Amino acid sequence: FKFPRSYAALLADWPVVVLGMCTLLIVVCALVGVLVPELPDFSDPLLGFEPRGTTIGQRLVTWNNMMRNTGYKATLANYPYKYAEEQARSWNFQKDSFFCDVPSDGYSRVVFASAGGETLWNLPAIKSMCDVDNSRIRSHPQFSDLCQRTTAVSCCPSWTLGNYIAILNNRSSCQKIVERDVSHTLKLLRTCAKHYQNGTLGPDCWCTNVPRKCTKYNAVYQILHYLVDKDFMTPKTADYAVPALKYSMLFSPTEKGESMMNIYLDNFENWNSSDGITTVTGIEFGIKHSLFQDYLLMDTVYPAIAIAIVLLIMCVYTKSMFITLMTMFAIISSLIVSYFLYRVVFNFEFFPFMNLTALIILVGIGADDAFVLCDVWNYTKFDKPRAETSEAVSVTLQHAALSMFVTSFTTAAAFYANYVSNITAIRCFGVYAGTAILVNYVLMVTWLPAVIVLHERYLLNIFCWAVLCQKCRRVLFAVSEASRIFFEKVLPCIVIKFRYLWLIWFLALTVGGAYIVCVNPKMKLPSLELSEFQVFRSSHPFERYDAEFKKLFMFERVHHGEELHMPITVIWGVSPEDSGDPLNPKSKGELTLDSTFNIASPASQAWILHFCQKLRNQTFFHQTEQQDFTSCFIETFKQWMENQDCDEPALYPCCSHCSFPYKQEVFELCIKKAIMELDRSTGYHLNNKTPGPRFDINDTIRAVVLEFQSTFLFTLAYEKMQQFYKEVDSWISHELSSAPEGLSRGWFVSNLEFYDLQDSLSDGTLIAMGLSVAVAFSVMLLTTWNIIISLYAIVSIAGTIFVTVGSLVLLGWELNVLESVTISVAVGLSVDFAVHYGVAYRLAPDPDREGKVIFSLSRMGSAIAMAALTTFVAGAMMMPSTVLAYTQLGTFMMLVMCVSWAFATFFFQCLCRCLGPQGTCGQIPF
Ligand SMILES: CCCCCCCCCCC(CCCCCCCCCC)(CO[C@@H]1O[C@H](CO)[C@@H](O[C@H]2O[C@H](CO)[C@@H](O)[C@H](O)[C@H]2O)[C@H](O)[C@H]1O)CO[C@@H]1O[C@H](CO)[C@@H](O[C@H]2O[C@H](CO)[C@@H](O)[C@H](O)[C@H]2O)[C@H](O)[C@H]1O
Ligand SMILES: CCCCCCCCCCC(CCCCCCCCCC)(CO[C@@H]1O[C@H](CO)[C@@H](O[C@H]2O[C@H](CO)[C@@H](O)[C@H](O)[C@H]2O)[C@H](O)[C@H]1O)CO[C@@H]1O[C@H](CO)[C@@H](O[C@H]2O[C@H](CO)[C@@H](O)[C@H](O)[C@H]2O)[C@H](O)[C@H]1O
Ligand SMILES: CC(C)CCC[C@@H](C)[C@H]1CC[C@H]2[C@@H]3CC=C4C[C@@H](OC(=O)CCC(=O)O)CC[C@]4(C)[C@H]3CC[C@]12C
Ligand SMILES: CC(C)CCC[C@@H](C)[C@H]1CC[C@H]2[C@@H]3CC=C4C[C@@H](OC(=O)CCC(=O)O)CC[C@]4(C)[C@H]3CC[C@]12C
Ligand SMILES: CC(C)CCC[C@@H](C)[C@H]1CC[C@H]2[C@@H]3CC=C4C[C@@H](OC(=O)CCC(=O)O)CC[C@]4(C)[C@H]3CC[C@]12C
Ligand SMILES: CC(C)CCC[C@@H](C)[C@H]1CC[C@H]2[C@@H]3CC=C4C[C@@H](OC(=O)CCC(=O)O)CC[C@]4(C)[C@H]3CC[C@]12C
Ligand SMILES: CC(C)CCC[C@@H](C)[C@H]1CC[C@H]2[C@@H]3CC=C4C[C@@H](OC(=O)CCC(=O)O)CC[C@]4(C)[C@H]3CC[C@]12C
Ligand SMILES: CC(C)CCC[C@@H](C)[C@H]1CC[C@H]2[C@@H]3CC=C4C[C@@H](OC(=O)CCC(=O)O)CC[C@]4(C)[C@H]3CC[C@]12C
Ligand SMILES: CC(C)CCC[C@@H](C)[C@H]1CC[C@H]2[C@@H]3CC=C4C[C@@H](OC(=O)CCC(=O)O)CC[C@]4(C)[C@H]3CC[C@]12C
Ligand SMILES: CC(C)CCC[C@@H](C)[C@H]1CC[C@H]2[C@@H]3CC=C4C[C@@H](OC(=O)CCC(=O)O)CC[C@]4(C)[C@H]3CC[C@]12C
Ligand SMILES: CC(C)CCC[C@@H](C)[C@H]1CC[C@H]2[C@@H]3CC=C4C[C@@H](OC(=O)CCC(=O)O)CC[C@]4(C)[C@H]3CC[C@]12C
Ligand SMILES: CC(C)CCC[C@@H](C)[C@H]1CC[C@H]2[C@@H]3CC=C4C[C@@H](OC(=O)CCC(=O)O)CC[C@]4(C)[C@H]3CC[C@]12C
Ligand SMILES: CC(C)CCC[C@@H](C)[C@H]1CC[C@H]2[C@@H]3CC=C4C[C@@H](OC(=O)CCC(=O)O)CC[C@]4(C)[C@H]3CC[C@]12C
Ligand SMILES: CC(C)CCC[C@@H](C)[C@H]1CC[C@H]2[C@@H]3CC=C4C[C@@H](OC(=O)CCC(=O)O)CC[C@]4(C)[C@H]3CC[C@]12C
Ligand SMILES: CC(C)CCC[C@@H](C)[C@H]1CC[C@H]2[C@@H]3CC=C4C[C@@H](OC(=O)CCC(=O)O)CC[C@]4(C)[C@H]3CC[C@]12C
Ligand SMILES: *[C@@H]1O[C@H](CO)[C@@H](O)[C@H](O)[C@H]1NC(C)=O
Ligand SMILES: *[C@@H]1O[C@H](CO)[C@@H](O)[C@H](O)[C@H]1NC(C)=O
Ligand SMILES: *[C@@H]1O[C@H](CO)[C@@H](O)[C@H](O)[C@H]1NC(C)=O
Ligand code: NA
Ligand code: NA
Ligand code: NA
């Protein structure tokens, strides 16, 4: 029998036990992790982007549960269906010479710009647009199945300038037009645009106040409204010898959607996008989110190239391809083991596509501890040459293992702090990436020291070319000693000799970053709808369509310019709750009816009439010359009763003789009659969105809905939508507080989905960042046991963060979903170089603060720079990517390494050289 008396003896005496047991546990996690759970589905990028458990979120979830469960023999109905049954017992533009339809937002389309920046209103450009449509769309084998038709002989014509010129100038097609048709149609537009600008000319005049010349085919209206950019025909542009057409649109007679993807993938995806006359600058085929998964999985080639560069750096630093490959195996194993823990142990069903971004992060930050442990091992061999391997192991762990933990933990804690967000995808990403970071640490203090012991024991001897080897060894020596001279002589001189320059420069940058973040221009919230969220780089044609061209065309602007009033919907008899799993996007739970509700009592009838009339007297209510007889159903019912006659006994309980507080049995009787009477007398039809009573399976009223229109207009601005929400919710809450028992539990809902998202981005970032800062300063104290070093560190970290976040604001980032996570993660990353220099400063033998800074830079500079570099390189490799999340994360990684390294190496070490503690000054007791 044999057994090691300590962990340092286990690593030294039995390395193969540690590596064998680790490899076994890893292949078990790999096998069970791929065999047991359902694989991730990335087909919707926006899955999990709704807050869950917010007041507004639960009411919004509840109102959606009510709408899916309303209908014949559903949980709820608009119609009393038991009563309904119980009563029922008693192309060529000369020959054809029209377009098949008006252009619309439902058709597949492309935006053209000029090659070489000239105006598109010329015969070469006009034909080149028709040429691209024929060449790239109508030619495709499934166009003929997808296109609209008048007969099986041919598809409909496309809507483009050349075909409007052909129909107006009696040509057969765009290909047969001549230069006189182009200038004639310009003179027609340039003179008739007046009546479009003034609002007289309109869609269907083929309006008689406009000269007939204009109204032909609706062509002048359709060109100006659909096909040309808004700046073309305005009084400011039209007085030019030729007005400048910068952009034009083409519409295809095929519908937007997943049917477009073969046409896209064959003819557009790998295309040059230019004919040499004109360039396709925007595409709207209805396939942006449907193409996401392909680009997402293809772009995994750049994280793979990043692994090869991080292997080169680490092999040159360690001088060992064995230690290097075994270190990268442990890095990748931490992603596998974290995935097994996440899906099998923690039981997360949802895996957001941002969990794939954890590979880039771990490739970048995974090897930092290997640089530390290898440096400390080499220092330990040098300062104890005659040590037994278990003593060389224990001394190496005594020096390295805590520093390695505080640096891993502060970044993991920053990821886990995002689990306070209400947004499901943010919480799921925080838990997965935080777990991979901690699993990577466990491997760096088990696997990696056992690998270092096997290397030491065997591979120092075991496992023309000899010339190439000797020449390579000579270059590797030169790089070693040049780097040693830099970190141990050059860099300490540059930091210390210019300390008063550095303190002024880095403090001025800190004040500048704080002004940009806290004063002007501050970081903004997202400013477009969730279905308009960017997924590709902004140069992609699908993103340029949304970011530029939706502003420049009149038919697209009409959708923005709409004066849409906020609805005020008030629901009783249902509980506003989210009984689904808040970590699963597809688990919305079931509708919960309220058992204390009662509309039918005389007191409930009386109060809910008075609520309707008191609400109509508010300044938030919009009065209309058209009455709405749906809005408050009890007024329309009271009105109907006051028009019922009494000479037939079959109508008697419903008589006009009855005072309004109807006996409970007359209310639930005559309401059913009134609802059935409506359905055939008026012919008005009730759908799941219509306000009224809701009946259950055997016709008892289990819910009531009211709806009113507001003065407040729907906006994407946070500050104004917060004033609508606070004004109406606090008035309705105050008014409800005096309601009868059985109406005091009602609730208000409206189009608040985007405001709830904005409110959760703002809240979750503040809390996750406050938690991330609290952990960073706490471990800084517990690492250093000195308040002065801990103050200089947290001030350098604060300057790092203000410069990092102010730089993201100058680059034009908003506080959207992944951006909001990077801001707490900045804190967690920014810790590391200040804790490493801070421990080297206290460790220093030298009594004088200058000698302590020289020892700190000398000992620690090499490993700190290798860590910064491998993270910067992992970020730089993501820059060719098509997926926007990969380019945003790689941009953040480069920037935060530069700022973090500069503030740690120069500013923090200059504070230590000017006023760093000596003896026991600032030291904390036990
Ligand atoms: C958390 C992990 C999530 C994993 C999710 C699953 C991903 C599965 C698909 C991964 C994937 C890339 C490789 C990724 C490696 C890293 C994997 C992860 C490991 C950790 C990092 C497989 O790529 C495959 O690689 C094979 C070779 O390995 C190759 O084999 C061939 O040669 C053999 C030899 O002669 C021969 O024998 C065999 O017969 C051949 O066919 C296949 O043809 C090829 O499809 C998909 O991309 C494929 O390749 C291209 C890449 O550029 C990609 O290019 C486009 O987009 C790029 C991006 O914008 C861009 O750069 C390119 O310019 C652009 O053109 C292609 O569209 C796509 O087809
Ligand atoms: C789940 C409930 C859903 C309710 C759905 C309601 C649907 C709308 C019907 C409401 C209704 C019938 C009610 C039938 C009984 C229903 C009982 C139900 C009870 C259970 C809840 C109310 O009928 C009202 O009757 C009153 C008398 O009782 C009468 O009052 C007066 O009395 C004396 C002169 O007769 C006088 O001397 C006295 O001074 C007055 O006071 C009003 O003038 C009259 O409008 C008919 O109102 C008409 O509705 C039209 C659209 O159908 C609507 O059309 C316009 O607007 C449309 C856009 O909106 C648009 O598209 C149309 O193009 C447009 O032309 C009219 O503008 C509207 O006028
Ligand atoms: C070498 C690699 C794989 C790095 C990680 C090594 C270990 C630290 C991991 C690998 C598998 C993990 C185990 C996977 C499954 C479980 C079952 C789980 O079982 C319980 O009964 C939990 C009950 C509860 O929820 O309270 C407890 C944690 C445990 C042992 C895990 C603890 C941590 C383990 C041993
Ligand atoms: C790769 C994973 C998935 C499974 C590995 C399972 C076993 C095949 C491993 C686990 C622990 C290993 C053992 C750990 C320690 C040693 C002591 C080692 O002793 C020595 O002094 C080296 C002698 C030599 O081989 O020259 C001999 C191999 C052995 C028995 C190892 C053989 C292979 C073992 C049984
Ligand atoms: C990035 C991940 C996927 C790497 C996974 C690596 C493993 C498949 C392991 C198992 C056995 C290892 C090999 C065992 C022995 C050697 C001999 C070794 O010979 C040397 O001259 C070592 C010199 C030195 O490093 O000091 C070079 C590495 C290599 C091929 C090892 C490289 C890493 C291997 C292939
Ligand atoms: C760093 C790596 C080595 C470990 C990361 C943990 C893996 C065990 C997980 C994380 C994400 C998973 C992938 C997520 C997505 C896909 C695409 C899927 O193929 C599709 O085309 C899915 C189509 C669809 O369902 O819509 C095949 C499985 C795969 C590669 C999964 C395989 C297992 C992966 C790599
Ligand atoms: C999820 C589970 C598997 C994680 C459990 C943690 C362990 C895998 C690691 C993490 C850091 C390791 C420690 C890092 C540093 C040291 C100091 C080292 O040296 C001393 O204690 C010197 C004592 C002396 O001789 O005076 C001994 C091993 C030890 C305790 C290590 C023991 C194993 C630890 C606790
Ligand atoms: C990417 C960010 C976040 C981290 C930045 C780290 C750099 C400041 C480090 C990484 C590698 C370092 C280099 C490694 C080796 C050398 C050789 C060294 O050569 C000498 O001192 C002269 C030797 C001779 O005279 O032969 C000069 C500095 C330099 C370029 C170093 C400068 C500092 C570098 C660029
Ligand atoms: C630290 C901040 C400002 C951002 C990163 C620094 C870089 C922008 C580099 C590029 C060129 C560098 C400069 C190149 C040459 C010199 C002269 C050098 O003069 C000395 O007296 C050196 C003495 C010695 O050799 O020991 C002092 C540092 C300085 C200003 C360097 C400081 C760091 C600089 C500005
Ligand atoms: C103290 C040091 C160590 C770290 C820096 C912390 C804060 C001073 C900064 C960094 C990022 C800032 C946040 C970035 C973005 C926003 C969105 C912003 O939302 C708005 O409504 C802005 C106007 C609008 O968009 O309508 C509210 C402030 C907030 C949370 C900021 C509050 C102040 C924060 C947390
Ligand atoms: C909100 C935060 C991110 C920025 C503002 C922080 C300031 C309120 C404090 C915190 C630490 C202070 C620094 C602590 C130490 C020094 C070194 C000190 O050096 C000397 O006095 C050198 C000359 C001499 O020794 O006589 C000069 C002031 C300075 C930069 C201080 C200036 C004011 C600082 C930056
Ligand atoms: C290519 C080799 C031979 C020279 C590398 C020179 C370096 C100084 C590297 C380090 C960072 C690199 C930059 C990192 C990022 C970008 C952004 C990239 O644009 C994008 O992909 C947009 C990214 C985003 O949208 O977030 C264009 C190249 C550029 C300037 C890179 C150019 C080359 C740089 C300056
Ligand atoms: C020496 C260290 C600092 C690492 C250097 C990394 C470089 C090799 C990277 C940094 C920026 C990269 C470039 C950033 C952006 C692009 C645009 C990209 O354009 C595309 O059309 C493909 C991507 C897409 O379609 O989204 C082609 C590669 C290229 C030049 C990249 C090639 C690789 C570069 C030069
Ligand atoms: C933007 C920030 C975050 C990172 C910048 C990293 C490097 C690009 C900078 C940091 C310090 C700079 C160095 C500061 C001093 C020198 C010494 C200078 O002179 C010599 O090498 C000879 C010195 C002698 O022995 O006399 C040449 C430029 C160099 C290497 C500089 C090149 C650019 C360096 C490596
Ligand atoms: C802490 C310092 C001493 C060194 C850190 C690395 C530097 C190379 C970083 C820090 C701040 C960065 C700057 C922060 C902000 C901007 C504005 C940014 O955006 C714009 O000017 C607007 C672009 C647009 O039109 O959208 C372009 C890059 C730039 C100059 C950055 C370039 C790289 C800088 C100088
Ligand atoms: C349209 O132009 C006429 C003059 O031709 C002008 O009287 C009228 O006020 C304009 N329309 C509007 C909405 O002002
Ligand atoms: C591709 O686009 C360029 C302009 O960027 C144009 O000159 C060239 O003719 C186009 N076609 C091909 C096949 O390169
Ligand atoms: C009425 O419907 C409920 C289920 O919603 C059922 O429990 C009850 O037995 C039904 N009563 C009659 C008389 O149909
Ligand atoms: Na790194
Ligand atoms: Na670490
Ligand atoms: Na950290």
Swiss-Prot record:
Gene null: resulting phenotype: Death at or soon after 9.5 dpc probably due to abnormal embryonic turning and looping of the heart. Embryos also display defects in development of the forebrain and branchial arches.
Residues annotated as glycosylated: N198, N378
GO molecular function: molecular carrier activity
Keyword Protein biosynthesis in record: no
Subunit structure: Interacts with SHH; via the cholesterol anchor of the dually lipid-modified SHH (ShhNp).
Main location: membrane
Domain annotation SSD: ranges: 282-454
Keyword Transmembrane assigned: yes
Protein name according to UniProt: Protein dispatched homolog 1
GO biological process, one term: embryonic pattern specification
Location(s) in or outside the cell: Membrane
Gene for this chain: Disp1
Highest taxon in the source lineage: Eukaryota
Annotated transmembrane regions: 16-36, 296-316, 321-341, 345-365, 400-420, 434-454, 500-520, 769-789, 791-811, 821-841, 864-884, 892-912
GO cellular component, one term: membrane
Family: Belongs to the dispatched family.
Topological relation to the membrane, as annotated: Multi-pass membrane protein
Its biological purpose: Functions in hedgehog (Hh) signaling. Regulates the release and extracellular accumulation of cholesterol-modified hedgehog proteins and is hence required for effective production of the Hh signal. Synergizes with SCUBE2 to cause an increase in SHH secretion.
Keywords: Developmental protein, Glycoprotein, Membrane, Transmembrane, Transmembrane helix
Section of the entire sequence shown: 174 to 1143 of 1521
Species name: Mus musculus
